[PDB]
mmCIF file of C-alpha atoms and ligand atoms in Angstrom:
data_model
loop_
_atom_site.group_PDB
_atom_site.id
_atom_site.type_symbol
_atom_site.label_atom_id
_atom_site.label_comp_id
_atom_site.label_asym_id
_atom_site.label_seq_id
_atom_site.Cartn_x
_atom_site.Cartn_y
_atom_site.Cartn_z
ATOM 1 C CA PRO G 1 1.990 -42.379 -79.064
ATOM 2 C CA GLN G 2 -1.003 -42.228 -76.689
ATOM 3 C CA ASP G 3 -0.841 -41.122 -73.010
ATOM 4 C CA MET G 4 0.559 -44.212 -71.279
ATOM 5 C CA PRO G 5 1.910 -44.942 -67.797
ATOM 6 C CA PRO G 6 5.689 -45.108 -67.421
ATOM 7 C CA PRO G 7 7.470 -48.457 -68.008
ATOM 8 C CA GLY G 8 7.336 -49.915 -64.527
ATOM 9 C CA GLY G 9 4.159 -48.092 -63.551
ATOM 10 C CA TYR G 10 3.626 -45.268 -61.104
ATOM 11 C CA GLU G 11 4.741 -45.616 -57.506
ATOM 12 C CA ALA G 12 2.131 -46.130 -54.808
ATOM 13 C CA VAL G 13 0.256 -43.222 -53.293
ATOM 14 C CA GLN G 14 -0.855 -42.653 -49.698
ATOM 15 C CA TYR G 15 -4.514 -43.487 -49.146
ATOM 16 C CA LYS G 16 -4.726 -45.377 -45.836
ATOM 17 C CA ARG G 17 -6.111 -43.321 -42.938
ATOM 18 C CA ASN G 18 -3.258 -41.393 -41.309
ATOM 19 C CA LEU G 19 -4.103 -39.453 -38.112
ATOM 20 C CA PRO G 20 -1.147 -40.143 -35.799
ATOM 21 C CA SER G 21 -1.494 -39.397 -32.095
ATOM 22 C CA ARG G 22 0.666 -36.418 -31.163
ATOM 23 C CA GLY G 23 1.932 -35.908 -27.634
ATOM 24 C CA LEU G 24 0.787 -32.293 -27.741
ATOM 25 C CA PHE G 25 -2.786 -33.515 -27.172
ATOM 26 C CA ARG G 26 -2.516 -36.264 -24.610
ATOM 27 C CA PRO G 27 -4.704 -36.045 -21.487
ATOM 28 C CA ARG G 28 -1.915 -36.944 -19.068
ATOM 29 C CA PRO G 29 0.624 -34.167 -19.858
ATOM 30 C CA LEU G 30 -2.120 -31.570 -20.254
ATOM 31 C CA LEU G 31 -3.646 -32.435 -16.870
ATOM 32 C CA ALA G 32 -0.241 -32.484 -15.194
ATOM 33 C CA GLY G 33 0.924 -29.171 -16.626
ATOM 34 C CA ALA G 34 -2.445 -27.675 -15.749
ATOM 35 C CA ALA G 35 -1.917 -28.757 -12.143
ATOM 36 C CA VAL G 36 1.507 -27.104 -12.028
ATOM 37 C CA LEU G 37 0.177 -23.806 -13.368
ATOM 38 C CA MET G 38 -2.811 -24.002 -11.025
ATOM 39 C CA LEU G 39 -0.708 -24.827 -7.960
ATOM 40 C CA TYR G 40 1.921 -22.171 -8.663
ATOM 41 C CA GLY G 41 -0.834 -19.626 -9.261
ATOM 42 C CA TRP G 42 -2.352 -20.299 -5.857
ATOM 43 C CA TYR G 43 1.130 -20.049 -4.351
ATOM 44 C CA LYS G 44 1.596 -16.509 -5.690
ATOM 45 C CA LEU G 45 -1.967 -15.712 -4.658
ATOM 46 C CA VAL G 46 -1.248 -16.644 -1.029
ATOM 47 C CA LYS G 47 1.807 -14.363 -1.098
ATOM 48 C CA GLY G 48 -0.160 -11.532 -2.763
ATOM 49 C CA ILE G 49 -3.193 -11.461 -0.437
ATOM 50 C CA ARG G 50 -0.995 -11.867 2.650
ATOM 51 C CA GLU G 51 1.008 -8.768 1.489
ATOM 52 C CA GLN G 52 -2.161 -6.761 0.560
ATOM 53 C CA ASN G 53 -3.729 -7.413 4.007
ATOM 54 C CA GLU G 54 -0.448 -6.122 5.556
ATOM 55 C CA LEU G 55 -0.547 -3.115 3.143
ATOM 56 C CA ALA G 56 -4.144 -2.570 4.367
ATOM 57 C CA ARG G 57 -2.947 -2.628 8.049
ATOM 58 C CA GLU G 58 -0.436 0.217 7.340
ATOM 59 C CA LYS G 59 -3.053 2.373 5.490
ATOM 60 C CA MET G 60 -5.481 2.029 8.450
ATOM 61 C CA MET O 1 -24.599 18.860 9.625
ATOM 62 C CA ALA O 2 -25.534 15.230 8.762
ATOM 63 C CA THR O 3 -22.910 12.502 8.103
ATOM 64 C CA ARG O 4 -24.942 11.202 5.130
ATOM 65 C CA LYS O 5 -22.984 11.423 1.863
ATOM 66 C CA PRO O 6 -24.871 13.867 -0.478
ATOM 67 C CA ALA O 7 -26.256 12.855 -3.921
ATOM 68 C CA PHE O 8 -27.955 16.120 -5.054
ATOM 69 C CA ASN O 9 -25.688 18.862 -3.569
ATOM 70 C CA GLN O 10 -25.549 21.888 -5.937
ATOM 71 C CA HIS O 11 -24.790 24.461 -3.179
ATOM 72 C CA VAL O 12 -22.454 25.091 -0.192
ATOM 73 C CA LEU O 13 -23.299 27.020 3.040
ATOM 74 C CA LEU O 14 -20.706 28.938 5.094
ATOM 75 C CA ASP O 15 -20.757 30.704 8.458
ATOM 76 C CA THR O 16 -18.558 33.758 9.004
ATOM 77 C CA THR O 17 -19.312 33.726 12.754
ATOM 78 C CA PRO O 18 -16.227 33.057 14.955
ATOM 79 C CA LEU O 19 -15.995 30.829 18.065
ATOM 80 C CA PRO O 20 -16.816 32.908 21.201
ATOM 81 C CA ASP O 21 -13.960 34.607 23.125
ATOM 82 C CA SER O 22 -14.663 32.176 25.974
ATOM 83 C CA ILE O 23 -13.086 29.383 23.893
ATOM 84 C CA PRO O 24 -9.266 29.677 23.500
ATOM 85 C CA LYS O 25 -8.062 30.103 19.888
ATOM 86 C CA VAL O 26 -5.902 27.415 18.193
ATOM 87 C CA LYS O 27 -4.186 28.032 14.812
ATOM 88 C CA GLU O 28 -5.457 25.093 12.669
ATOM 89 C CA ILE O 29 -3.020 22.660 10.936
ATOM 90 C CA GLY O 30 -2.255 24.030 7.457
ATOM 91 C CA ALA O 31 -0.870 20.847 5.925
ATOM 92 C CA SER O 32 -2.735 19.150 3.046
ATOM 93 C CA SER O 33 -3.531 15.397 2.486
ATOM 94 C CA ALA O 34 -0.174 14.161 1.019
ATOM 95 C CA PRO O 35 2.052 15.883 3.654
ATOM 96 C CA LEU O 36 -0.263 14.655 6.499
ATOM 97 C CA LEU O 37 -0.008 10.946 5.352
ATOM 98 C CA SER O 38 3.840 11.247 5.152
ATOM 99 C CA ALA O 39 3.909 12.629 8.708
ATOM 100 C CA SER O 40 1.161 10.445 10.204
ATOM 101 C CA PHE O 41 3.432 7.763 11.653
ATOM 102 C CA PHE O 42 5.464 10.562 13.234
ATOM 103 C CA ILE O 43 2.364 12.299 14.572
ATOM 104 C CA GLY O 44 1.398 8.956 16.069
ATOM 105 C CA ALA O 45 4.842 8.316 17.550
ATOM 106 C CA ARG O 46 4.783 11.727 19.353
ATOM 107 C CA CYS O 47 1.045 12.538 19.936
ATOM 108 C CA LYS O 48 -0.378 9.098 20.769
ATOM 109 C CA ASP O 49 -1.231 10.053 24.381
ATOM 110 C CA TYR O 50 -2.963 13.284 23.288
ATOM 111 C CA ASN O 51 -4.775 11.520 20.393
ATOM 112 C CA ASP O 52 -5.730 8.706 22.833
ATOM 113 C CA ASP O 53 -6.878 11.288 25.443
ATOM 114 C CA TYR O 54 -9.187 13.184 23.025
ATOM 115 C CA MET O 55 -10.994 9.969 21.917
ATOM 116 C CA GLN O 56 -11.319 8.630 25.548
ATOM 117 C CA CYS O 57 -12.814 12.005 26.572
ATOM 118 C CA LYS O 58 -15.412 11.773 23.729
ATOM 119 C CA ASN O 59 -16.246 8.157 24.798
ATOM 120 C CA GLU O 60 -16.586 9.574 28.337
ATOM 121 C CA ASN O 61 -19.269 12.095 27.273
ATOM 122 C CA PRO O 62 -21.526 10.355 24.735
ATOM 123 C CA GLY O 63 -23.444 12.831 22.605
ATOM 124 C CA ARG O 64 -21.537 15.777 24.102
ATOM 125 C CA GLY O 65 -17.938 15.149 23.015
ATOM 126 C CA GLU O 66 -17.877 18.076 20.580
ATOM 127 C CA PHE O 67 -18.641 20.652 23.323
ATOM 128 C CA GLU O 68 -16.973 19.067 26.436
ATOM 129 C CA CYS O 69 -13.615 17.848 25.055
ATOM 130 C CA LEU O 70 -12.433 21.095 23.368
ATOM 131 C CA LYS O 71 -9.181 21.450 25.436
ATOM 132 C CA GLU O 72 -8.025 17.951 24.328
ATOM 133 C CA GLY O 73 -8.731 18.850 20.667
ATOM 134 C CA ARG O 74 -6.635 22.030 20.970
ATOM 135 C CA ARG O 75 -3.906 19.847 22.583
ATOM 136 C CA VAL O 76 -3.891 17.369 19.598
ATOM 137 C CA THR O 77 -3.768 20.247 17.067
ATOM 138 C CA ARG O 78 -0.809 21.820 18.942
ATOM 139 C CA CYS O 79 0.967 18.436 19.372
ATOM 140 C CA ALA O 80 0.559 17.658 15.660
ATOM 141 C CA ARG O 81 1.820 21.129 14.683
ATOM 142 C CA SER O 82 5.014 20.432 16.638
ATOM 143 C CA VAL O 83 5.907 17.419 14.492
ATOM 144 C CA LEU O 84 5.078 19.305 11.290
ATOM 145 C CA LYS O 85 7.375 22.146 12.331
ATOM 146 C CA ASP O 86 10.039 19.692 13.469
ATOM 147 C CA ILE O 87 9.950 17.798 10.171
ATOM 148 C CA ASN O 88 10.129 21.133 8.352
ATOM 149 C CA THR O 89 13.152 22.466 10.231
ATOM 150 C CA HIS O 90 15.050 19.183 9.933
ATOM 151 C CA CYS O 91 13.748 17.058 7.031
ATOM 152 C CA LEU O 92 12.394 19.632 4.587
ATOM 153 C CA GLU O 93 13.825 18.212 1.358
ATOM 154 C CA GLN O 94 13.144 14.552 2.181
ATOM 155 C CA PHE O 95 9.663 15.315 3.479
ATOM 156 C CA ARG O 96 8.770 17.133 0.269
ATOM 157 C CA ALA O 97 10.387 14.363 -1.763
ATOM 158 C CA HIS O 98 8.069 11.820 -0.132
ATOM 159 C CA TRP O 99 4.666 13.513 -0.121
ATOM 160 C CA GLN O 100 5.151 14.717 -3.690
ATOM 161 C CA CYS O 101 5.709 11.102 -4.831
ATOM 162 C CA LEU O 102 2.595 10.215 -2.753
ATOM 163 C CA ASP O 103 0.560 12.890 -4.607
ATOM 164 C CA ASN O 104 1.562 11.363 -7.982
ATOM 165 C CA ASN O 105 0.944 7.786 -6.687
ATOM 166 C CA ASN O 106 -2.735 7.806 -5.437
ATOM 167 C CA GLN O 107 -1.487 8.378 -1.846
ATOM 168 C CA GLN O 108 -0.408 4.693 -1.849
ATOM 169 C CA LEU O 109 2.524 4.243 0.601
ATOM 170 C CA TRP O 110 3.879 1.090 -1.165
ATOM 171 C CA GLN O 111 4.274 3.181 -4.369
ATOM 172 C CA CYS O 112 6.844 5.583 -2.782
ATOM 173 C CA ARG O 113 9.013 3.241 -0.602
ATOM 174 C CA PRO O 114 12.492 4.689 -1.543
ATOM 175 C CA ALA O 115 11.390 8.264 -0.536
ATOM 176 C CA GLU O 116 9.917 6.958 2.809
ATOM 177 C CA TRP O 117 13.144 5.032 3.618
ATOM 178 C CA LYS O 118 15.134 8.256 3.205
ATOM 179 C CA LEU O 119 12.663 10.539 5.063
ATOM 180 C CA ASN O 120 12.300 8.022 7.951
ATOM 181 C CA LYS O 121 16.096 7.847 8.594
ATOM 182 C CA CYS O 122 16.258 11.625 8.546
ATOM 183 C CA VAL O 123 13.376 11.828 11.026
ATOM 184 C CA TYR O 124 14.885 9.074 13.212
ATOM 185 C CA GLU O 125 18.273 10.740 13.612
ATOM 186 C CA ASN O 126 16.971 14.300 13.990
ATOM 187 C CA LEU O 127 13.516 14.229 15.668
ATOM 188 C CA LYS O 128 14.250 10.781 17.207
ATOM 189 C CA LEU O 129 10.780 9.428 16.121
ATOM 190 C CA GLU O 130 10.161 5.941 14.628
ATOM 191 C CA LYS O 131 7.331 4.431 12.465
ATOM 192 C CA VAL O 132 5.629 1.555 14.388
ATOM 193 C CA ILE O 133 2.684 -0.534 13.075
ATOM 194 C CA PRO O 134 1.173 -2.947 15.678
ATOM 195 C CA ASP O 135 0.282 -6.676 15.199
ATOM 196 C CA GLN O 136 2.358 -7.092 12.020
ATOM 197 C CA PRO O 137 2.962 -10.872 11.482
ATOM 198 C CA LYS O 138 6.266 -11.804 13.206
ATOM 199 C CA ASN O 139 7.368 -14.572 10.771
ATOM 200 C CA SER O 140 7.115 -12.232 7.741
ATOM 201 C CA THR O 141 9.402 -9.157 7.424
ATOM 202 C CA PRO O 142 7.294 -5.933 7.960
ATOM 203 C CA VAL O 143 5.682 -4.732 4.647
ATOM 204 C CA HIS O 144 7.168 -1.174 4.989
ATOM 205 C CA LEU O 145 10.638 -2.759 5.365
ATOM 206 C CA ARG O 146 10.250 -5.277 2.466
ATOM 207 C CA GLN O 147 12.766 -4.735 -0.373
ATOM 208 C CA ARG O 148 10.306 -5.914 -3.025
ATOM 209 C CA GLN O 149 6.816 -4.364 -3.182
ATOM 210 C CA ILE O 150 4.447 -6.644 -5.188
ATOM 211 C CA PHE O 151 1.779 -3.930 -5.735
ATOM 212 C CA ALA O 152 4.252 -1.165 -6.760
ATOM 213 C CA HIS O 153 4.030 -0.212 -10.478
ATOM 214 C CA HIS O 154 7.738 0.759 -10.577
ATOM 215 C CA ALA O 155 9.945 -1.908 -8.967
ATOM 216 C CA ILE O 156 11.899 -0.764 -5.877
ATOM 217 C CA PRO O 157 15.500 -0.196 -7.059
ATOM 218 C CA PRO O 158 18.211 -2.684 -5.807
ATOM 219 C CA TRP O 159 20.429 0.236 -4.645
ATOM 220 C CA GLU O 160 17.635 1.768 -2.515
ATOM 221 C CA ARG O 161 17.612 -0.115 0.849
ATOM 222 C CA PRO O 162 14.886 -0.164 3.610
ATOM 223 C CA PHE O 163 15.560 1.842 6.785
ATOM 224 C CA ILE O 164 15.737 -0.048 10.097
ATOM 225 C CA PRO O 165 16.651 2.107 13.139
ATOM 226 C CA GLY O 166 19.533 0.832 15.340
ATOM 227 C CA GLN O 167 21.238 -0.999 12.428
ATOM 228 C CA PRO O 168 24.242 0.573 10.571
ATOM 229 C CA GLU O 169 25.331 0.037 6.945
HETATM 230 C C1 LIG E 1 7.083 -34.713 -24.872
HETATM 231 O O1 LIG E 1 7.861 -34.858 -23.991
HETATM 232 O O2 LIG E 1 7.515 -34.242 -26.117
HETATM 233 C C2 LIG E 1 6.864 -33.080 -26.544
HETATM 234 C C3 LIG E 1 5.354 -33.306 -26.525
HETATM 235 C C4 LIG E 1 4.896 -33.777 -27.904
HETATM 236 O O3 LIG E 1 5.840 -34.671 -28.422
HETATM 237 P P1 LIG E 1 5.559 -36.285 -28.255
HETATM 238 O O4 LIG E 1 6.852 -37.043 -28.432
HETATM 239 O O5 LIG E 1 4.566 -36.728 -29.303
HETATM 240 O O6 LIG E 1 4.953 -36.578 -26.751
HETATM 241 C C5 LIG E 1 4.724 -37.899 -26.358
HETATM 242 C C6 LIG E 1 4.374 -37.928 -24.870
HETATM 243 N N1 LIG E 1 3.819 -39.223 -24.522
HETATM 244 O O7 LIG E 1 4.705 -32.110 -26.200
HETATM 245 C C7 LIG E 1 4.498 -31.927 -24.827
HETATM 246 O O8 LIG E 1 4.761 -32.794 -24.063
HETATM 247 C C8 LIG E 1 3.929 -30.606 -24.314
HETATM 248 C C9 LIG E 1 2.635 -30.875 -23.550
HETATM 249 C C10 LIG E 1 2.107 -29.566 -22.964
HETATM 250 C C11 LIG E 1 2.887 -29.229 -21.696
HETATM 251 C C12 LIG E 1 2.607 -27.783 -21.294
HETATM 252 C C13 LIG E 1 1.142 -27.617 -20.898
HETATM 253 C C14 LIG E 1 0.831 -26.125 -20.800
HETATM 254 C C15 LIG E 1 -0.058 -25.846 -19.590
HETATM 255 C C16 LIG E 1 -1.433 -26.468 -19.806
HETATM 256 C C17 LIG E 1 -2.490 -25.367 -19.765
HETATM 257 C C18 LIG E 1 -3.885 -25.981 -19.684
HETATM 258 C C19 LIG E 1 -3.989 -27.117 -20.694
HETATM 259 C C20 LIG E 1 -5.442 -27.368 -21.082
HETATM 260 C C21 LIG E 1 -6.053 -26.110 -21.694
HETATM 261 C C22 LIG E 1 -7.148 -26.508 -22.684
HETATM 262 C C23 LIG E 1 -8.466 -26.715 -21.945
HETATM 263 C C24 LIG E 1 -9.622 -26.280 -22.836
HETATM 264 C C1 LIG E 2 -10.316 -23.645 -8.874
HETATM 265 C C2 LIG E 2 -9.819 -22.925 -7.625
HETATM 266 C C3 LIG E 2 -9.069 -23.897 -6.725
HETATM 267 C C4 LIG E 2 -7.986 -24.582 -7.542
HETATM 268 C C5 LIG E 2 -7.210 -25.587 -6.700
HETATM 269 C C6 LIG E 2 -5.742 -25.585 -7.116
HETATM 270 C C7 LIG E 2 -4.853 -25.658 -5.876
HETATM 271 C C8 LIG E 2 -5.500 -24.874 -4.728
HETATM 272 C C9 LIG E 2 -4.817 -25.201 -3.405
HETATM 273 C C10 LIG E 2 -3.651 -24.248 -3.172
HETATM 274 C C11 LIG E 2 -2.737 -24.856 -2.116
HETATM 275 C C12 LIG E 2 -1.310 -24.336 -2.280
HETATM 276 C C13 LIG E 2 -1.219 -22.918 -1.717
HETATM 277 C C14 LIG E 2 0.242 -22.575 -1.463
HETATM 278 C C15 LIG E 2 0.751 -23.398 -0.281
HETATM 279 C C16 LIG E 2 1.610 -22.488 0.587
HETATM 280 O O1 LIG E 2 1.338 -21.339 0.678
HETATM 281 O O2 LIG E 2 2.718 -22.998 1.265
HETATM 282 C C17 LIG E 2 3.488 -22.016 1.898
HETATM 283 C C18 LIG E 2 3.041 -21.874 3.351
HETATM 284 C C19 LIG E 2 4.177 -21.270 4.168
HETATM 285 O O3 LIG E 2 5.135 -20.739 3.301
HETATM 286 P P1 LIG E 2 5.671 -19.209 3.583
HETATM 287 O O4 LIG E 2 6.288 -19.147 4.958
HETATM 288 O O5 LIG E 2 4.512 -18.243 3.499
HETATM 289 O O6 LIG E 2 6.803 -18.807 2.456
HETATM 290 C C20 LIG E 2 8.011 -18.261 2.898
HETATM 291 C C21 LIG E 2 7.803 -16.798 3.285
HETATM 292 N N1 LIG E 2 9.048 -16.254 3.796
HETATM 293 O O7 LIG E 2 2.727 -23.136 3.862
HETATM 294 C C22 LIG E 2 1.399 -23.277 4.275
HETATM 295 O O8 LIG E 2 0.703 -22.328 4.353
HETATM 296 C C23 LIG E 2 0.854 -24.661 4.621
HETATM 297 C C24 LIG E 2 0.692 -25.485 3.343
HETATM 298 C C25 LIG E 2 0.317 -26.917 3.715
HETATM 299 C C26 LIG E 2 -0.903 -27.361 2.911
HETATM 300 C C27 LIG E 2 -0.619 -27.234 1.416
HETATM 301 C C28 LIG E 2 -1.446 -28.275 0.663
HETATM 302 C C29 LIG E 2 -1.322 -28.045 -0.841
HETATM 303 C C30 LIG E 2 0.133 -28.219 -1.269
#
């Protein structure tokens, strides 16, 4: 026999465009989490510089 | 000689000539940098008036302070030798424990807080002298009595506690 398809034919393949939006790359959560990092970082910075200026007062 | 910081200094000049007999002799302080920083807040707590008197004399004779305020300078040297002797005869181990840590830590006080909190309580109960830093913010706990030092490379140990005079354990 020659090279034929199987009796019922092959099952469908995937060809339609498939680029599904993933929550890892959405501009709301990224902006929000950026704001939390950026606001906490300034919080620690206020503590740090306030302590360093006091450390500077003792050295003087 | 000039107060300019040198950039091309390849030589040093000395002067073996001694101060004239008319000027009273004072044995100079023999302590080095790390011991003097560990005793500074105790020099201040005992010799403030003498330190303050020297500087007010110099500001009273502008351009002539070096020659006309010599008695005050001898008085500060003597006053500051008294604390050094007192710390030696009563806090010798703790004092060495502190300024040796300071020598290994870039002379940064925040880097040797557990040794200061021991030396300070020995000085307070023996020489009755107490470290005071003016204009520290009132809301915040003083930085030399803070349990956690943020700029210290080795974290202050939980067991080691800060020393506040007039408070028991
Ligand atoms: C969400 O809750 O589930 C996990 C989510 C991805 O899962 P998903 O279900 O697809 O999200 C749908 C959200 N509408 O995944 C996430 O929600 C995580 C989103 C990231 C949250 C952490 C952000 C880290 C801090 C941001 C740093 C700066 C971000 C920008 C940096 C790049 C700028 C060049
Ligand atoms: C790019 C570069 C810029 C990026 C911008 C990102 C965000 C920058 C703005 C930073 C503002 C937040 C700084 C931290 C706020 C803060 O320090 O609040 C604490 C302070 C008093 O708190 P405190 O007493 O020091 O803590 C207990 C100590 N025992 O309370 C205060 O000092 C008053 C705070 C009121 C105003 C805060 C408004 C923002 C929230």
